[PDB]
Structures are given as structure tokens and as C-alpha cells.
Amino acid sequence: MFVARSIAADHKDLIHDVSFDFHGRRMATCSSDQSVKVWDKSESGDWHCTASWKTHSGSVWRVTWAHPEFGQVLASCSFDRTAAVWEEIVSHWVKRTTLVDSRTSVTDVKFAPKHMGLMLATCSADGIVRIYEAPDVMNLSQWSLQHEISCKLSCSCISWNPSSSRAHSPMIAVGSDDSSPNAMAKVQIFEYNENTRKYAKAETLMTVTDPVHDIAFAPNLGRSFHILAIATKDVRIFTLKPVGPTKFEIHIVAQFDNHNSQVWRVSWNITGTVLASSGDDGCVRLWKANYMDNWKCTGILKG
Amino acid sequence: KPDILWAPHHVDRFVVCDSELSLYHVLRLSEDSAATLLSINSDTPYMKCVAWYLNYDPECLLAVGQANGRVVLTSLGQDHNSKFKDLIGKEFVPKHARQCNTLAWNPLDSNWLAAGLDKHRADFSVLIWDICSTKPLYELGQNDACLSLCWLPRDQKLLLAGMHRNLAIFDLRNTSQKMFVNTKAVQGVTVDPYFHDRVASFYEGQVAIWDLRKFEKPVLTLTEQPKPLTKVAWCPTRTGLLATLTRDSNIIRLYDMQHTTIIERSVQPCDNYIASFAWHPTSQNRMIVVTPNRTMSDFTVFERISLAWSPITSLMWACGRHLYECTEEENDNSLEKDIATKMRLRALSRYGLDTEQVWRNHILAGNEDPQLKSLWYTLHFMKQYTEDMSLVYAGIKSIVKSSLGMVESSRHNWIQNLNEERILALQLCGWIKKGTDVDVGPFLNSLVQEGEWERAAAVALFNLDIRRAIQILNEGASSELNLNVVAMALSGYTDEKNSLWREMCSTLRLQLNNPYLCVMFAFLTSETGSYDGVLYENKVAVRDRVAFACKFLSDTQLNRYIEKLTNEMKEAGNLEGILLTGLTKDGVDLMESYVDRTGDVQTASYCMLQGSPLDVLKDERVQYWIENYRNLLDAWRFWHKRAEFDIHRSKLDPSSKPLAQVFVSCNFCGKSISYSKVTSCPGCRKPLPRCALCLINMGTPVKKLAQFNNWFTWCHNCRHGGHAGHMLSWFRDHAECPVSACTCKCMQLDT
Ligand SMILES: [Zn+2]
Ligand SMILES: [Zn+2]
Ligand SMILES: [Zn+2]
Ligand SMILES: [Zn+2]
């Protein structure tokens, strides 16, 4: 049902990460020479360039956007133990802050859902997950550190819980990529406690006992549960149902093997019904649900 | 160990060493790739180590060492114009009986290739022998066995060798001057073209990496593998890639040395074991491998892929240096589009915003979904009885719950005599027209004209009209067949005892395909009192079964059936149940199950707003759906549609308050000037602020009476105001605040 096309965009190096904005008119890409580019669309449909600048000391893994009610804000995380925040002044992006609390390489950075303010969580390779806030939305040079979480493993990916209902407390999930020859669980979920004002472990997926390269949540849209997606040697989909931290009834609904390799990335769409996956065979596959609530492949695209 | 060597100056011609020398030029390598052989030479017995000539001339010329020790440069191509055939087939006998281990032509010189023999006692191993166009020109390496040797890619006077248990480096100027550093790996010594000062070596299941500048200890140590390594090399096309292969393995091990953590990866070329592999000198990210079944496939080592979605439901991904997009893009006119596209198109068609005739939304929806016709027809029927006439939106199960008085009938003497509580039910079902009408004639006459006869047959029979249905099932039963034959049996009926007709009529029923005649036969083959066959059938619309129940069951039997059906409807999520649940608490569970099933918030938002009571609109689950729909409309940049929805939602539901914004306050009171000169403050009667262009006080009365050109307008950064028309005219040709000694570009702060 899907058809592929090439996009006219000149790059000189290899791309590490791609990201979009809320409306889908800008994008940011980071390359091998430590450069970030911001691409703008047009009425005709072509893409043009607007900025280009070298950022960090070491290699740059990630770049992410922010909600437009806060301005034009970008966040990047790199190998030299820092994460940075960029803002647009009109057009030359400037630096605002540099988070240096880490002692090893930062692997992932993510902005928080809107209704909690302007918040940002990073994660490192020593087993620490940290959370920052900005109490003034018109002063992005002043940030604060609020929580620390010790995971006793090597973090490799994080994801927030998009749900904004009044009955869901804030949630976060952390994966691990350690290859230690043992049988420890490699995905745990942390939940906020409104009474003690701390974060506490709530569940631990004990069936995932293999290396994990990516996790992702899916938008609520008013459902009764949560949908989670994992990226290990196979693609799996879990569900959590609500029933001291709350209790869940974790099920499983999907376990696919059609890559014969290690899948690297998983990403959902705005409604939360279609899934994308990228494996080490150079193909991108899309999955959907069916009438019988059974997940079946939809399309196969070769890069 | 058969290995593959790519031709020095051919991009499609590949050489794969086997029992007999073989060259192939581009064996279906891939779906659209084929390999063709050129020539085969078999003069070399017991080959151990091989090499190819560096110079383009001669072409397809390779130098190979046998097991007895013979090195006779051999050509394979169609050569009839040899520049010098003095070496054609010519050997060069070494002074000792042994087998050559490895030989490499020097990078700088075309005709120089040094080879290292086995572990001799007191006779050399690695010597420089000139190919010209009798004895070696330089031999060294006493008390050592040349497991491997290599040439310096940049230096014209340097080389390195692998002794039995140590690594040594040799130079052209001097022979005995060397730097010896012991190591556990002495096999697979090579130089990466990008990084000259890097070295590698392999030790059984372990692999080591070294740097030439500080070659004292390994820079990195890789994980030990189960099977022993077979060949180590470097990628020629992409920088910072090194690979290792094993024995009886189908997926290779690839590792990148671009860290300064070394990213590990594996590629599976096929489903069979690969004997060896090689990297084509010019082809980008291409590997040529062979299998012992005389079948070859050129694999590739892809780069990682990144992903990103957009609200328009288009997916964009990056592969290396390029960007690709994908979407449905009107691929076809088939069914099963994702719900996001459906809702966007429905939003462009003004779906659910028809108030005069409710049932048109199901043709505005798009394709034919049987649930969205039942729901909208039910909501259409629920409004006439309300306009013509609060108890209606509670549902069937509430109107029937108060039923009192009835009589179970056991005779069949072939509607106004029954309770009004079951008359409103039948009105909602749509069997009869609204009012005191006594005949189902209109419904039957409307069903027949639409082509559907059998359903009309069942309805006409259910209210005791066998002979008045005989026509309905055999008159319109010739054009477009069977039906006469199907209804021949019909005339055998009507309440006998155990007999030949009733005995088998209830047994062969399942042979007939269509449902409605199955239920129609189900009726008359049942013990008077029980109707399980007619009341539990999933291929008959809830409408007809509910009507049948409301016409035939008893007061204390109806209420259990309604409860069971409603529980099934709620747990299922079928939208046809609104006729039973109604717009009450239970309707919220039904809608919630529907949303969990399909994720459609548009129908929920436009349905729950249709005259629901103020108790259910306050449930904190409808508001979540409405807000999610509004946010979806915002994302697609559909801003006038959102305001249109907001107007129609504030008209109906008055619980929610509109947006909260700023207001203007008087300078002398502090109170608001919102809602007796029009110009003065309503509180203190003191002048309001004056316009910066016409210098006349602002104000508005509180044909048109307050037009747009006289509204307040102010910058939110410097707080200087004026009339709307005046400021609109000023900010066309200038860009600065009209007030003197100000600096704002009061219009550029947004655009
Ligand atoms: Zn006043
Ligand atoms: Zn201003
Ligand atoms: Zn001003
Ligand atoms: Zn004015």
C-alpha cells in the first residue's frame, strides 16, 4: 500500500539520526562530520536548507525537537559527556546551556510531554538516568536538576509515556544493551509517586533477556491501556493494563522474526496503529492490526 | 583454503581460486545480475598460496605457488599480443624443498614479489626475487618461519613479516636492523588504505588490533569466537571497516574502527556456508563470496537506517547519504486505508455537521461501513420522537424495563393490542411508521422495491401472514431463481404433531445458505415457548431480533434476553448496540470498547454530543476524546474546521468554558473596561487610551454597530496601541512602532 521515492537533499557524510517537528515542515539531520542541518519545506513541495553548524567535540548520536508553544528548541547528545540546547534567533541558531553532569557518553535525549512543562531527560552508559527542568520559559539559559535514577546496568534508550489524562501518572522506560552472559531483565519501567515526590520501579519485563537497541511507546488517543514496542533480535509488542505504585497485567500480542537480523529502530505514527522497523538487511517494514486484532505485515520497502 | 581474489583493473571480472583457476566476468549472482566465465586453466597441481600481477599489462596474469614449491606466473585471458612471454609458464625453483605460505607483490614496484616458505632449518624463508620480464636478490629471516608478510603502502623501503611466534618489520636499506615485539597473533597482517599506522593479526578464536606508532601491546582485543578465523582484511571502499570470517559460518562478523566503542555487526549473505569472501577494489559496499556448490552471490553490507513519521501519514527514512519518502499517495482505489487518512478526508467533507437530516452522515462517511449506517439511522430515528413529542435516549433496555402485563400465546390463528412500551420499541426498530399505525404494509412495500425480498419475506411471516407472504416469496422470485423451489416446502407447515414434515424440516435447515430463510424455518419447528434458533443468530440484524422479542416473548423473559444481548454487545464493541444501551453510562463503555478496537475518535465526539444528558457529558472519558480530536485537527493545520467544531460544540454542551485570554484595564480604577460616552471608562468616566495615529480616544459601542476597523490593537512587547485599520495601514510601508522614541519591529516579531 506504500510506494517509495527519493528526495533531493545533498549530504556529504553518513546520516546518524533524522527527526521531524510537530506540524511536519522542518527536519533536522546529524552527520558523521559533527554537523546538524535544518531543512524547510515549501508550497511547491521541495526541501531547502536553512542552517549548518559544527556542534560538539566528539561524535553526535541524536537530535530531537520540542513543542512549538515553547519556541524553536533543539537538543543534541554526543560522545563527549554533554548534551546541548539550541534556539533560533532571526536566522542563526545559538547555544543556551550545556549539561555536563555526566561522567560517560550520553546515549539518548528526549523531551517530555507538554502538560508537565519544559522538561528533558538524558541517559548515559554508566547506568544513570537524569531529569532536568526550566522553571522560567522565557529564560532557557537556566536549568535545574531534579531527579536521578540508578539502573545497575548500561542504558541504551529511553521513552516517555505520551498519555495526558488526569488518571495516568508520569512514566518512563529504560532499555539496556549489555551482552553479559546472564539472565537479567533488560527493560524496566519507572513511575512517579505523587506523595513522596520520587520515582520508583513499578514493573520489569522478565521475558526480555537479550540485548535491546530501542524501545518506544505509542500515543494514547483515549484507550484503556498502553502499547510498548521493543527492538531486540526480534520485534515484539507488549500491552500494559492498569488494575504504592500501581500494578499492571503485562501481556504480549506480537513476536515477529521476518528480519533474520538485529532490528535497530522502531517508531509509531500519530494515531498509534502503524509501526515502522529497520533491520540489518537494508529493508523497512510496516505492521498493522487487523479485524481479528492480529498483527500482520502490510508493506516491504528496500532502501 | 580456496579464496577469492578480485582483478586489479576489472570492475566486473572476478577471480575465484578453486581446484582449477577460474575467472568470471559480470551464474545468477542476484535477481538482475549474471556472471559469465572467460577461461579456465588447470596446469597447476596442489595450489596453496596465490597472487595476481599488479600491473594492468598483462591482464588476467596471476602468480601462484604450488605445494612442492613451484611459483610459475600464469595467465588466463585471451592473449595473443604478449609484451613479454619469457615468464609465460616460466617457473623459478627455490633452493629448498618446501611449500610457499604467502607471497605479495610490492605496492610500489610492478615486478617484485617476495614469498615466505615453511619452517626451514638453516635456509631462508622470505626473499626478494625479481620477475624481470635464477636466485633471489635478497634473502633474510634466519631462525624464523614466514607465516605472513606484507609491504608498506607508503614506504618504498619497508616491509613486515610474521615469524613463528613474533612479529618483525623489515627495511630495504638494512636487513638485520628490526624492532621485535612479541604477540599472540601473527596471522592476517595487513594495512588499511585509510589508516597506514594500523596493523591487525588473528589468533585462533581471538582477534587483535595494533597501531604501528606504538606497536607494543594490542590497542583493542575482540571477543573470542567459537569457530577459528579464516581470513582477515579491510574494506577498500568505505573508511573504517574491518571484517573477519570463520569456518562453516553463514553470517560474517563486521566491526568498525571509527570509534577513535567498536560497533559490532554481522551480515548473512545467503542460507549456505561461504568458503571465503573478498572486497571488490572499486565497487562500493560490495562483497563477493563463494560457496562449495559452484554457486556465487554478491552480498552487500548496508548502513543503518533512521526513521521519522509525519502527521500527513508519510514516512521518511535515511540510508547512508540519501533520503527516501513513502506513503499511500493514492496508490489505488482499494479498501482498508489507515484511520488517520480516513478522518482527514472526512474532516474535509463536513462529516457529522449535518443537523437537519442526521442520516446523511453515513453517505458523507465515505465507503460503506455497516456499523456507521446503523448508528446514524438510529440517531435519526431518536430525534423525530422528541421533535414530534429524554426518556428516549436511555435506550431500549430502559423503556422495556418498566413493562407490565402480557400474555404468552400458543395458538396460530393466521399489534394494536399490546403495550405502548413495546410500541415505542418497535418504532425505534423502524418496523412501523411513527404513530398509531396498525399495519406493517409500508415497511414491506418499502423493502420489496429495494430488491431485498427474503428479508421482507421473514418480516411478513413473523406477523402471521403465511399466504400473504407466499406471494411475496414467489411473485418477485422469478426475475434474477430457486426461490419458488425454496418456498414450495413453505405450504407444508402450521402446528402439527410429530410428522414427516416437522421431523426433517428442522434437520436439513443447515443446508440452506442464506440466513433469513434459515430463521424463517427456525420459527415453525420449535416447541411453543422456546425460540433459541430465532433469538440467537449472529447473521440476523439486532433490529429484527429485538422486534421479534418485543412482539413474542413474555414480560419476565424479555428482560433476561435484553440483558444477555447487551452484555455481549458491550464486551464486543459493536456499534449497533446503541439502540439497546442508549446514551447512558453503558454507552460510554460501548464507545470505549469501540475506540480500543479501531481508534476512531471522530465518531465518538460527534455521536456523544447528540443530545446526551449532562450527567454523561461530565464523564472524564468523553472530554478526553473531544480534546484528542481537536489536537488532531490542530496538527494537520485545519484551523477553520476546528473553530467550526467549537461553535457547534459550545451550542450543544454548555458545561465547558471557552478559552481564557487577556483583557484591558482602566488606568485610574484598575477595573476592566469590558462588558455614558462611548469614549469614557464605564466605571469612573475618565478617558480611555488614545490612538497613536489619529490621536483620538478609543472606544466601541456596547447595519453593523461595531466594525472591525475600530477595535483595539496593541503590541505585546512594547504596549503601544491604536485602531485596527490605522495600524494595518501604517505597517504596510513602514516597520517600526508609530510612537516616537520606540524601537519595536512590532510586526516582525511573529512572521
Ligand atoms: Zn476607569
Ligand atoms: Zn512593540
Ligand atoms: Zn512601541
Ligand atoms: Zn485611530
CA dist B215 → B125, B183, B210, B591 (Å) = 24, 10, 6, 71
Question: Chain A contact for B306, CB < 8 A?
Answer: yes
B162: β partners? B148, B167
Nearest ligand by distance to the CA of B750: 2
How many secondary structure helices (H) and strands (E) does chain B include? 20, 30
Show the DSSP H helices in B211-275 as ranges: none
CA-based nearest residue to A116, from A21, A188, A27, A194: A194
CA-based nearest residue to B271, from B299, B242, B244, B230: B299
Cβ-contact A235, A229 below 8 angstroms: yes
Q: Which amino acid is at A40?
A: D
Of B304, B309, B596, the CB nearest to A224: B596
A93: β partners? A88
A289: β partners? none
Q: Cα–Cα distance between B167 and B160 in angstroms, integer?
A: 8
Minimum distance, in Å, between the CA of residue A50 and any CA atom of chain B:
16
**Cα of A207 vs its chain's centroid, Å:** 22
> Which of helix, strand or coil describes residue B728?
helix
The experimental technique behind this entry is cryo-EM
Cβ-contact A122, A109 below 8 angstroms: yes
Q: Cα–Cα distance between A66 and B196 in angstroms, integer?
A: 44
CA angle (B468 as vertex; B463, B472 as ends), nearest 5 = 105
**Cα of B437 vs its chain's centroid, Å:** 55
CA-based nearest residue to A217, from A280, A269, A291: A269
CA-based nearest residue to A75, from A121, A31, A115, A136: A121
- As a residue count, chain B comes to 751
Q: Cα–Cα distance between B500 and B470 in angstroms, integer?
A: 22
Helix (H) or strand (E) run with residue A227 in it: strand A226-231
Give B 698-717 residues with CB within 8 A of chain A.
none
Q: Which amino acid is at A112?
A: A
B450 conformational bin, left if phi > 0, alpha if psi -120 to 50, beta if neither: alpha
SS3 string, chain A, reads: CCEEEEECCCCCCCEEEEEECCCCCEEEEEECCCEEEEEECCCCCCCEEEEEEECCCCCEEEEECCCHHHCCEEEEEECCCCEEEEEEECCEEEEEEEECCCCCCEEEEEECCHHHCCEEEEEECCCEEEEEECCCCCCCCCCEEEEEEECCCCEEEEEECCCCCCCCCCEEEEEECCCCCCCCCCEEEEEEECCCCEEEEEEECCCCCCCCCEEEECCCCCCCCEEEEEECCCEEEEEECECCCCCECCEEEEEECCCCCCCCEEEECCCCCCEEEECCCCEEEEEECCCCCCCEEEEEEEC
Contacts of B131-140 with C-beta under 8 Å, sequence gap 24+, read: B131/B63, B131/B73, B131/B87, B132/B86, B132/B87, B133/B83, B133/B84, B133/B86, B133/B87, B135/B95, B138/B175, B140/B170, B140/B175, B140/B176
Q: Cα–Cα distance between A213 and B264 in angstroms, integer?
A: 13
First to last CA, chain B: 70
Q: Using CA of residue B566, residue B571, residue B572, residue B574, what is the dihedral sign?
A: positive
Q: Cα–Cα distance between A60 and A279 in angstroms, integer?
A: 21
CA angle (A58 as vertex; B189, A73 as ends), nearest 5 = 150
Helix (H) or strand (E) run with residue B162 in it: strand B158-162
Question: Chain A contact for B309, CB < 8 A?
Answer: yes
Cβ-contact A63, A19 below 8 angstroms: yes
Q: Cα–Cα distance between B135 and B705 in angstroms, integer?
A: 114
> Which of helix, strand or coil describes residue B523?
helix
Cα-flanking dihedrals φ and ψ of residue A151, to 5°? -110, -10
DSSP code, position B117:
-
Residues of A whose CB is below 8 A from B315: 2, 269, 276, 284, 286
Q: Cα–Cα distance between B451 and B470 in angstroms, integer?
A: 17
Question: Chain A contact for B572, CB < 8 A?
Answer: no
Q: What DSSP assignment string belongs to B653-691? A: --SS--------B-TTT-SB-----SSB-TTT--BPPBP
Beta strand pairing status for B286-290 and A26-31? unpaired
CA-based nearest residue to A279, from A293, A262, A266, A303: A262
Cβ-contact B483, B470 below 8 angstroms: no
The count of other CB atoms within 10 Å of the CB of residue A129 is 20
**Cα of A10 vs its chain's centroid, Å:** 26
Cβ-contact B16, B7 below 8 angstroms: no
B66 conformational bin, left if phi > 0, alpha if psi -120 to 50, beta if neither: beta
Q: Cα–Cα distance between B560 and B223 in angstroms, integer?
A: 69
Q: Cα–Cα distance between B532 and B638 in angstroms, integer?
A: 51
Residues of B whose CB is below 8 A from A242: none
Cα-flanking dihedrals φ and ψ of residue A272, to 5°? 80, 40
Q: Cα–Cα distance between B382 and B376 in angstroms, integer?
A: 10
Give A 19-38 residues with CB within 8 A of chain B.
19-20, 22-24, 27, 29
Question: B194, B235, B326: best mutation site toward chain A, by most A Cβ within 10 Å?
Answer: B326
Helix (H) or strand (E) run with residue B562 in it: helix B555-572
CA dist B163 → A299, B186, B224 (Å) = 55, 7, 23
The count of other CB atoms within 10 Å of the CB of residue A294 is 9
Cβ-contact B33, B23 below 8 angstroms: no
The count of other CB atoms within 10 Å of the CB of residue B550 is 25
Beta strand pairing status for A214-217 and A198-204? unpaired
The count of other CB atoms within 10 Å of the CB of residue B97 is 12
Residues of A whose CB is below 8 A from B300: 282
Q: Cα–Cα distance between B206 and B222 in angstroms, integer?
A: 6
> Which of helix, strand or coil describes residue B251?
coil
Q: Which residues of B are annotated as a binding site?
A: 666, 669, 681, 684, 694, 715, 718, 720, 723, 726, 737, 742, 746
Q: Cα–Cα distance between B594 and B591 in angstroms, integer?
A: 5
CA B663 / ligand 4 centre spacing (Å)? 19
Cβ-contact B477, B453 below 8 angstroms: yes
Q: Which residues of B are annotated as a binding site for Zn(2+)?
A: 666, 669, 681, 684, 694, 715, 718, 720, 723, 726, 737, 742, 746
Q: Tell me if B266 and A261 make a contact (CB, 8 A cut-off).
A: yes
Cβ-contact B657, B675 below 8 angstroms: no
How many secondary structure helices (H) and strands (E) does chain A include? 0, 25
Resolution limit in angstroms?
3.4
CA B705 / ligand 1 centre spacing (Å)? 23
DSSP code, position B742:
-
Q: What DSSP assignment string belongs to B393-415? A: TT-HHHHTTT-------------
Beta strand pairing status for A106-111 and A119-124? antiparallel
CA-based nearest residue to B80, from B63, B101, B60: B60
